Every structure is written in C-alpha cells, then in structure tokens.
Amino acid sequence: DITQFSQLNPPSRLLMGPGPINADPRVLRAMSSQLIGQYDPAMTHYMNEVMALYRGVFRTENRWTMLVDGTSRAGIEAILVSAIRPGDKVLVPVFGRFGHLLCEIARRCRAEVHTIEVPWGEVFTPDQVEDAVKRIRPRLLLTVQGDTSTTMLQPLAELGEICRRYDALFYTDATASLGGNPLETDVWGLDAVSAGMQKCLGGPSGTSPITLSARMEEAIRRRKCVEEGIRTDAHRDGDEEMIYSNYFDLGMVMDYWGPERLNHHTEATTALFGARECARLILQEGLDYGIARHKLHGDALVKGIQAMGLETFGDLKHKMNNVLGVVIPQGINGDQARKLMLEDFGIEIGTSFGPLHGKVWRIGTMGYNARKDCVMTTLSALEAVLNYLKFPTTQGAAMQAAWDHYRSER
Amino acid sequence: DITQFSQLNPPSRLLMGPGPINADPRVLRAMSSQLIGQYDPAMTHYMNEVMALYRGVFRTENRWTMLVDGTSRAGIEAILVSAIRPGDKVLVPVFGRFGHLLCEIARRCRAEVHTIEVPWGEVFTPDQVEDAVKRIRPRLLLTVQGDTSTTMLQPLAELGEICRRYDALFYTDATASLGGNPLETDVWGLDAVSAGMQKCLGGPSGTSPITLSARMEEAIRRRKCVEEGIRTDAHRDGDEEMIYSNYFDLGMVMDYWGPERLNHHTEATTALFGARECARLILQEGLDYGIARHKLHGDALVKGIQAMGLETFGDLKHKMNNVLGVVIPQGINGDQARKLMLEDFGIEIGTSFGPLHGKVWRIGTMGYNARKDCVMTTLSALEAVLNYLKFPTTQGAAMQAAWDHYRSER
Amino acid sequence: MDITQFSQLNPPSRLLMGPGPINADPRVLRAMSSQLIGQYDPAMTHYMNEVMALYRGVFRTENRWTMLVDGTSRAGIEAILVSAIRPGDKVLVPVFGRFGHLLCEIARRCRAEVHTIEVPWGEVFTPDQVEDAVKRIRPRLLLTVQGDTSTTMLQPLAELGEICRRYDALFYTDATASLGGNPLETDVWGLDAVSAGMQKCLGGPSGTSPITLSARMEEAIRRRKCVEEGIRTDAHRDGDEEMIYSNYFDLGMVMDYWGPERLNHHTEATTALFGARECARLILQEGLDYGIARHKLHGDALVKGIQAMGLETFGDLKHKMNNVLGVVIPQGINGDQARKLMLEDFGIEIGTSFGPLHGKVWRIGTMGYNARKDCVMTTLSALEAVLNYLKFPTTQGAAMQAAWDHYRSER
Amino acid sequence: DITQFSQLNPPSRLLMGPGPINADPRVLRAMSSQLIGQYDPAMTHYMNEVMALYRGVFRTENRWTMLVDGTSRAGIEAILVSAIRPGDKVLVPVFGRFGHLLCEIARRCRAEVHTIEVPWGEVFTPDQVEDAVKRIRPRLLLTVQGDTSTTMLQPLAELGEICRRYDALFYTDATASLGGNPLETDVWGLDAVSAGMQKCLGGPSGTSPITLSARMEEAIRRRKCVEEGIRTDAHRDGDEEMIYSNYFDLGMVMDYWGPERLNHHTEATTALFGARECARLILQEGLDYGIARHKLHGDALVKGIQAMGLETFGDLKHKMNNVLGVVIPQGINGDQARKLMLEDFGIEIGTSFGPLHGKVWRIGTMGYNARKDCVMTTLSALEAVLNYLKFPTTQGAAMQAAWDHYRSER
C-alpha cells in the first residue's frame, strides 16, 4: 500500500566516520529555497558568486573555478577525461584506497597508468615522486592529498615545483582534506583540484567543486568539441581528439559557466544553493581559522584515544586533522563496538575496508562536527562501550587528557 | 568583501517555460531534512523504497529501477555508455534538439550512429522506423518520447514489438514526459528508460531516475570489471570488454543499489530524499489522475492561446500534454515579451533555440505548475503584455475559452 | 477516524492581497524551521537582546524596553492596556473604523471608563478635534489606531503627541497594520506605547506582537509591580498601586524576563522569536526609509490601475494607507463571486469588507513581501479578467497602461 | 550596524532539562511551509483537523477542543478567566511551583483562592482533596497533573467522581504530562484541560491545546459578550457578567473555531501547522505506545542514576515518566556540572529553582528526546563530568544498569 510510505524521517545521528558527516543547518535550510529558471538573472548571478567564493576556498585566482554536478569522484573523472587522451602517460602515487580509484578512472580513460607505492599508512617523499617523474615522463601527476582510508595527508608543497621542471600537469584529489587542512592551489603550482561536499564542507554529497589553471584550461581547449544539438556555424574543434564523454567534457562545462552560457545541461539549482552556502560559511569564519579548528579537535581526540590505552594507525606526523585511525584492542569485535555506538548512542564511527577490516576504526572530526562537544561525546561513548564489552581503561584518563588539551590550547 | 555575500534569496517566480519548473513545496522541505551515514539501515531502507516507488512511476516490475546521481543527460549517458560497446551500431530517429543529444552521447560512446529525420515539429510512424531497422540493423533503438524543443510526443506503443521482432534494444528518454504523458515501460517493451526531476516530477535538476529490463542488465553484466580499490578475490570479469567510465558503470551502480552494497560512490543523501518525495507524491495522487490533470490544464492553455488569436506550432494530435509552442505573430518582439513577462509579472515563458529562435515561445504546464491558477495567470499576463505591445486581441476572448473548458470538464 | 487521511502539511499556493495575513518572506519561514535551544542558553538570551536592539530601529525609538509579546497583534494591545489601565481610569478613543471599536472593548474589559469620539468611514481626525476631546474628558490615555485596515485610512499622529504632553495624557498607538509600510516616528512623535503585528508589512506569520514602551510608561507599569507567587522571592516587593489584573499580560514581569534579572515569567516562543528576529533584520537591511517608499510606489501603482479600470475608491485618498486600497464593488456585480473567482481560479486572495461595508467594497492589500511590482500587475489583470467575464465593461488595456506608465515615470 | 546581525544559527543542543526540549524535525519542517488567508477553505479545514486530532490526544469527544495562541500558561489563564467570575471560590491543591501559578492566575481573575499543601515532592490523596471540597465548597478544582519542579505526578482518576459528587468543575494543567503520561479526560470526569507544546508534544512553545467539557461551555456561554467591532443585531449578552478579557474570552474563541467563524483574532498560521503535526505524529505512533516509550527511557535513566551512586528526589511511586530529580552530591558544584555539560558536551540538564536550587538537578526524557540514545549520551556525559570533578563511581556500573534494563525489556 502507498499509505505506508510516510514523510521523510531519518533518525538523529552524530556522524564521526570518514564521511558523509552531518550537514551544517544553514546549508540544509538553503536547500529548501524555491527555484528559478536556468537563465534567470539571479541564477547566472548565483553561478558567478559560486566561482568567486570557491576561488577563496581553493586559494586560487583561476578564472575556471566551478561545480561538477555529481559526487566527488565525478569531479575526478571530469578532470581526468578532459586531460587524458587515450595513450597518455599518467603517474599515480598510491598511498591508499583512493590512489587505486585514480588508477581505475585513468584506465577507463585509456591512459598508460604508471604507479609508485608506499605501504598503508605512510606517505611519499618529494624525491620519490621526482625519481618517478624522471623515469616515466608523465603528462599528469595524479595525487590524492588526504586519503580517508589511511588517514594520511600527502605533503603537496614541494611537488608543484617538481612538476613545472619536467612539464607535468599537477592534479590532486582534495575531497577529504579541503576546509580542514591547508591547500594552497596557486602557491603550490596545482593545475587541477577536485573536491567534495560531505567531508569538511558540510555538505551533503552530490556536488564536486573543481578549479583549473590557465595551463590546464589550454589542454582542454585543444580538445574542444561542442555537442551537436547546441553546435552553431561559429563553433570549431580543437587540434586534438575529443573528450570521450558529453557529460564530463569540461570544455563545454566551462562554456556554460562562461559569458557564452552554452546550454550543456540544467544546473542543479538546489545543490548550487547548498554549495554556495558551504563556501560562504567557510569564508565568514575564515579558512585559516577553519583549519585551526579542525587541528584543535583532531588532536584532542588523539590525546583522548591515547589515554584510553589505544594504539593509533599510520605516521602521525602526516595525519589529517579530521581523521584518526584507532587500532582495535583485540579480543574485541569491531562490528560490535560499531553497532553499539550507533544503535545505543546515535554515533556512527567508520569501519576500515580490505587490508584493515576488523583491525582499525576511523573516527572523523569534520566541518560542522569539528567541535568540542562532538569529540567529547564520542570519547565518552567509545569508552563506555569498551568497558561494557570488558576492555579495562584507567577511569577518567581518556577524558582528562581531552580536557587537558582543550585547557592548555586556550 | 565576504559581507557583501548574503543569505540565499531568489525572487518569487512562476516557471512556465520548458523547464526547470517550480518544485513541489513538499519536495523542498524533505531536502532540509537531516542526513544519515552511507550505510545506515535507514539509508538502505530509503534506497529500497525509492526503487519500489519508481517501479510504480515507470510502470514496471524491473528489479533494476534506481537513481543516477547527475542531471537528466547523465542518466542517459550512464545507460548508453553501459549498453554500447565501441563500434556497435545505433539508430536515432531525430525529431528535435534532444534527438541530436542522443547522437552525440552515442558518438562519445564510440558508436556508429545512424539517423532518420522528420521536420520540426512532426513525429515518426511505426512503419518509418521499421524500414530503418530493417535497413541498418542497429543493436539499439534510441528514442526521445517528449522532445521539449518541438513540444512533440513520439508514440512508442507499437515500436516495442518492432524492436522485439528484429531483436533490437529499445531505449527512451522520457525526462520531459514522465508523469505528464503515458509511459508503460513493460507493456510497451522498453529495455531502458531514463528521466529527470525538473519537468513533471517537481523537481530540481541533479538526479536521473532509470529503469533497466532483465535483457538490459544481462547485457551490462557481460561488461563486468570491478574497481581496483573496492575489488576483492570474489570479483571476476565479464566476457565482453569493460565500460569506459567508472562513475557511469551501471554494473557497479547495480551492485551498490542491490543486496551487496558495493561501495561505488556516496549516494546523494538530500537528492535521494527529493527523488523519494516526487515519486511518493505522484503515486499518492495516482499516475492516471496525474496524467489526466496534465492533459486538462494543457488543453485549457491551448484553447486559451487559440482564442487570443495566436497560432500554435507543431502537429497538435501528438503534442505533449505539458508543453505548447506559441508563434510570435511578427511585429511583436519575442525577447521583449519574455522580458516583460519575467520582470513585470514574475513569470518565465520559454524561448526557442536554433531554427525556431525568434519564432516560437514554449509555454509549459508541468508538475506543481499544472494547475488552473497557473494557466489563468499565464494567459492573463500574456494577453496584457501583448496588448501593451499594441497587439490587438478580442477583449476577454482568451480568458473566456479557458473558463468554458473548465466548465465543460466538470 | 482515521490516521491515514491526515497527511503531510500541504497548503495551496496563494498570493495574499487581502487585509491580512499576507505572504511571509521565505527567509522568515526558513528561520522558523531552525532547531531550538534551552530557555536560558547564552545563545537564546543573546538573540532576545538582538530582538530588542533590532526593534528599536523598526519602531524608530531609543526605548530600552522594546520587546515581544507572545500572542497575536491584539494580545500586545491587551498587554499594554491591561498594564496601563487601573479600573476607573479614564480613556479616550478616536474611532474612525472597525479597529477603533476593538480598542473600546479591550479598554472596557480592563474596567476603564471609555470615552470615544467619531468621524465617519473613511475620514480621519483633526488635531483640534482630539484636543477638544482631551480638554473635555481629561483622559489618562489617548488610544489610537494608526492605520485601520477596515477603512484603509491612516491617522496623522505627528501633531497628536504634543497635545498629550500639554494635558498629561499617555499616548498609545496600534500600528500592527502600518509599521514597515508607513512612517512611524515613535520617539519623535512622543509615543508612550506602540504595538505591532507580524502578518502585515513585516512578513510575518501572525502570533507575535512587538511592543515598545517609553521611559514614562515603564514608570506607570512598575507602580503596579507584583511578582507571581511561584517565582517570587523575599527581595521582591509590590508597587504602590493595584496589581495588573492578568498574569500573562502583566508587562512588568515580561520586562523583568527580558531584563538582566531574567525572571522566569513564561517560556518565550523560540520559533516565533526566530521569525520576528528575521522580519526586523530584513527590514533594516533594505532600510526602513526604502521599505516605506516601496509600499508607496506599488500602492500608488495599484490605485492608478484601478482608476483606469473605471472603478471607484473608498474614503479620503489624502490620508490613505500605503499598503491597502478600498475598491467600490460596481453594481450589480457580486463581490463574493469575484472573490470566489479570484481565489479558486487565479490563486489570488482579495479582501471583503466586514460590517456596514459588506458587498460594497473590496480591500486589496500590497503589503510587505507582496509589496512588489509583479504582485500589483497580476492582481490587476486577474481582476479585469474576472470583471469582464462577469460582463462589466472596461477599456481594453487601460488598467495595465496606467500602471506601466506609473512604473516608467517613477524609474 | 546591521551587517553584524547574521542569519539564524543556534548551536546544536541536546535538551534534557525540564523544558523546552528539542523539537521533532517533522514539526520544524511543517513550520517552514507558506501561509494561506485566515478564512481560506484550506485554513478552516486544517483547523477542523486540529480539533479532531487533539480530541484523540486528550482522550475526549469534546467538541470544544482547540488552541490558544500563546504559551502554556496563556491557555490556563484563558480557562480560568472564562470560568471564574469575581468572588467565585477556587481550591488549588499545591504540590510544587506550578500549584502557585494557578493561585496567582485565579487571584488576577478576582477569585477567592483556597489552598491545601503537601511538601515537595509528595502527592495528594483523594481523601485530602475531598475533605477540602466539603470544607470550602469550591466552584473550581485547580490541579497540576505533572509538576516538573518536583517531578511528581498527581493521580486524577478518583478526583473526577469527587468533583461530580460535590458539584465542582474540575480543571487540570497537563502541559508537562500530556503525551508522556496517561490522561483520560472523559473517563476522569474532567471539565477543562490545557497543555503546551514544548514538553512531550515537540513542540516549540507558543500554542496551548485546550479542551472544554459540555458542562464548561454552558458556564462560558452564560458569560457571553461579543466584541463591538464583530457584533451584529443577531447577538445578545448572556445572563452572567462578562469575561474580563478580550483575547482570552473563550466564548468568542469557540465562535472563531465554530461554524460562524467569528473574527476574534488572526489564528497563528505557522504554529497551527506545528500543533497539527505534533498531534498527528503522536497519534501515528499511537498515544498508548508513546506513553509506554516515555516510561521505558524514564525508567532506564533512573536505574543508571541509581547505579551511579546518586540519590533521587521525591516519592518514586508517583514520579513523572519524563522527568527525574537528581540530588546533587556534597562538594560537587551543581551549577558547574551544568556549565561543563552544556559547553563541553552540548547537553542541557535542568537546574532547580526555589527550595531545591543548588540541591537537585532536573533531567528530562521527553518527546523527541525520549529515545535510547539521548538516555545513554546523558548518562555517560554526567558520569564523565562528575568523575573529572573528583567524584568516585564504580566504573561501568551506571551504563551497565541502563544496558541491562534495555536488554531485559527487549
């Protein structure tokens, strides 16, 4: 019966996993706003505002800063499909799960995929990526900045200089790290950045902010091929082969956001309203302050976890501010502590996949949930569940260290 | 300055163009609802409900009825990229702008594209497409049901049996027509149908509902190749070559929406909620009642437009219930009427593009805006502007014919 | 019963061009959907303070005691009059419409001696007339409506405050209909108490009445001080006058709740406070001076189109409210039928006149969020379309021409 | 400057105090809906639905069941002002802070107030109040059902036969108990009931649900006096003296909610949508189950508190389901635990006023917050705060008793 389909009623949740995390209530309210037509002066104005705001968030002057209407990895694929002609040599430094995602996307683009690897969860040295760039001579360097599966944050500062010397295009996947970690697009010589909403932005998934450098926009303009239905007598192709997607042809997407207002697709009015608010909030607070906030609560969680008598995963010198790997004590079922946290406390913490499944928990402190009270509620909840499942902890230690960190820093 | 970016505030608009149209107030409210985690039992229940609900909207029992996170033409591209291997022949009976869009998507899929043509705005006879099928022998017949650029509805009822005899896969692009005109997916023997929100569903763009037949999923299953980051020892490749997109690989999307919950992408939580309401609302009213309503208000607009002394573009026998083409009668300027309708009445009427640009307005009566008061307000505003632009009409004649129609309809 | 036939909230789309309530600003509606906090959360006492300062701007006053009354517009009226009137106290009410009559009844229930002076609908009072009446009856209070939606008339107030200062009468005004759409210089005109509404030019769901009280008014109310037993302490004492005969409408305790003591009088309406906060915030972003000028522009555009349409108007146009218009129903046109066909066929609500003006005059409002160019245009064309269909002759395109001409000239 | 007055952004709070408490999000979404005119066919229908819905909530068939526009105590004042003529004798059984509220309201109606007392927090016997009714012969019996300030629930069942016997009108204030406790309006011979929204209904304050027995309406009709502005020749005053309030004259409010639709005031459109939702949700769950839910979580919290080695306040046999009085231990600062609970955990627990200030905390489990996870979160948080403040508990015991209670009941 159609009668037993009632109104939307999701249960209340504190999402402290690797994502998606709770949306900021201002972003949610802005999505309920009524729509206007595709080319209404207000809609074109709001599109132009989104560009200016995300230029601030990405820390770039790039003319082409916009949205791909799809989840984070649609942005990735849009950038790769637009920058990779079949046969092109691509270099992917793999330090986790999302390095393999780049490999697959690149392979679906028919690229020549060359990889370098370090174990989970470690990071790459600038020398390591320089030796690889000298060996294979790639068109693109395809990096993930923050990889949620390993909690590791790849240093990106010294890599852009390396890419300019050997004429490589420098792309990063910043969906996990943007807003909660430093990302200087221009200062670090980045050519393409793709992000997401559901990490530190806040932020339901469905949009991918991207930015393309002047060098990157030239490579795509050589690929120019306008869709037949909106092709005029004054449109002409570029010197190189077309992009093998109509939806992900970023040249046409650029022409939609540009003065031409080329009718590539109907922009996601609501998701645009959402995206505008995220960047607006991030810049009202300030990027530096926003990043400083993620560091404060990330560290407080670490110090809480360490005092609970728990090992942590990875090289902490390079840990993301917003993700923590927590080793499962042993004699303790991980799926059971996850089930108890959720059903009895309303707190979701992440499981790890593959070579870590049943070994490591992933606790995020991102965007809206990067607060003291989210950290405090999670630590007290985790400890309570562990004691109930017979894991001894020093009474008050985990909580004391959390307070000690919050007291000392302010 | 950041302070010169304020709270989202779009102007009050009546969207009577070819789309996007105004959303249902219930749909926008459901979007403000709080999020849950990707793998919360509530999320997987809501996905299971969306599948069930869209089977009723599409009029199908297809186990594989689900959402593509992207604009309407993303759901198309997901299907074409998943069904067409490089080389495979394809037939597109072009009768408007969106016939051309299908041609391009298939081109980017690396297909040999065959076309037949009728002039805007006419429609194909079953005999015309059968003679084309006999001639070129396509793997796929790729059709649009409602092409909003001509206001024409392609009859599909007999074509399904045509495709069964000569063993061709039958796809329709029903974004503009779903919910507003008849579409019996199973009874008409369709293999693939894709849609959009912003037309009759109501409806912000950003999501594309799709349904796949048992024959279709079998064809896509032959292309099996699981992404490296989420690949396990269980995953073996299909006998045919891979799909050349990660995001559009419907083989993996089916595995995400099915019982295995294969982690392909983070499903757009808010967009899913909107998608859920649209279907839930349509089925609460009843699909038949919903279509009948779209007919009634469309017909009243037609009779109102004709009595104003304005001619109607296209073959009226096959007109979409939800769209009308009104001819600009020379002397009067089309862009000037549109500007006045928008700036002074807050009403968007559609312009035309390409060949019909400057000749035809496209007035739509879809979804939430398929009401009497919307029609009355459009007809009244239109006649006021035309008269103000010194275009003579018989006083009260346009409104008279609309009232008489609504009187007779009772 | 059952329970399935009661579905999700789904009101029909309406353009409200009647006397009230009118369409609320969408930003206000969104603000109301926001999550709540505890009664004395630092954020809540903060927002209450924001609502005080913000409403000092909209009223045009420096008054410290500018706050909210939790109830519809007439609850703030009752709140003020129950607090200011001891039984037997003398009261003067210049009645020039239906709402002057409301002030009389409210005053009557406060057990006051109610003196009234009358001009016809829709005429307005002269300063000399109120002065002659004040000289006569010797009132403690002068009670006016600034804008009476029943007759569309706007009482000049500027000359009235001085009169009250010479004869020691307390000067109150009901500005629920006028605030935001017409000038109201609270402190400049020497007002003691003002009460407003949300649902008119503020926009604005009904259920809250903003009030402001001058330094002299608080003195009069604090003389009646008496704290409710449950929240009363040994440090509390009664004033030198009789208690206000109401617990809820005792404005002394409400003042104490909104003040630094935070005396627990009631649980302040959180949602309604978010809405009321927005209304004032939005009004001051655009600017009150521009808010008033906008109402004037679109209000005048309505009357020019109505006149071109061949219709008569009600009352003195010299003093007409910026936000409403009285339109004489032609003969033998049915007013109820026109209203029925405006609502059911165009999704536009136009007002009927109650009492001695029913079936004689419509009340068409151009208020707050609907004080827009596109609202005026749609109402006029719908009326002309409804009228002509009921077989009433109009000059073709005349109504719209005069309206379009007005917007052209003003730009 | 108006630029430093930004958009509404309240901090996330788990309200576990005496009230107001966090609202159910479905009710919040209902308030964001757009408004219709006072006398719109849709407004009166929703009003008629509201009347029917609350009849189900109050457990009555009373035709005069409706809303007062104002907070809980405005509805109390409405019922008292309409029923009480000056000089009338009234009896108020006082057992807490709100007992005194009824005394003050009756006093300002110029009634003679008679009282009997029990210490905080005891309850009245049928005999105690029957002795008093014989003694003073009251017109009204004025009782609080659940007094949050003491956590005590007065039995009303036997009080209805006592009132009917000695010919007294029986009123009660049920703002705290309604929804979370049994209330049989008709079965308990109740003449008038008033409640609020922000306790168990859920529910921001601003509306007062009332119900009036056939007996009560006769008494209010005798006092008939219609406001001069909405008075016609077809009206005549009743035999009794007028109700000394315009806004609170329940004779006129009845006429506004009846067939005549007498224009007494403009009904709060936004709040009525909320109150319409609140009643709908409670009846969708089913009042019996709702009451049962409130008891489960109330019982859970207590056990955990008792297992924490904390004393409790009041006669536990008669405790409200949705409130707990927790005695503040020697040396632990009552107001300091509150600061740490709110600022560091984002959880509000109630302070006591009057003869319990500094001695007792009030912890509520009401409406939307009567869930398992709100109980768990608050318990672990309070324990963490107490522990940090050097107050020894038996590690794990407080969570154990709660977990054991939930496991046993499932």
UniProtKB/TrEMBL annotation, chains A, B, D:
Its cofactor is pyridoxal 5'-phosphate. GO terms for biological process: glycine biosynthetic process, by transamination of glyoxylate. Substrate binds at R362. Residues 43-349 form the Aminotransferase class V domain. It comes from the Bacteria. InterPro entries: Aminotrans_V_dom (IPR000192), PyrdxlP-dep_Trfase (IPR015424), PyrdxlP-dep_Trfase_major (IPR015421), PyrdxlP-dep_Trfase_small (IPR015422), SP_NH2Trfase/AEP_transaminase (IPR024169). One of its GO terms (molecular function) is L-serine-pyruvate transaminase activity. The keyword Acyltransferase does not apply. Keywords: Aminotransferase, Pyridoxal phosphate, Transferase. The modification N6-(pyridoxal phosphate)lysine is found at K199. The keyword Transferase applies. Belongs to the class-V pyridoxal-phosphate-dependent aminotransferase family. This is Putative ureidoglycine-glyoxylate aminotransferase. It comes from Klebsiella michiganensis M5al.
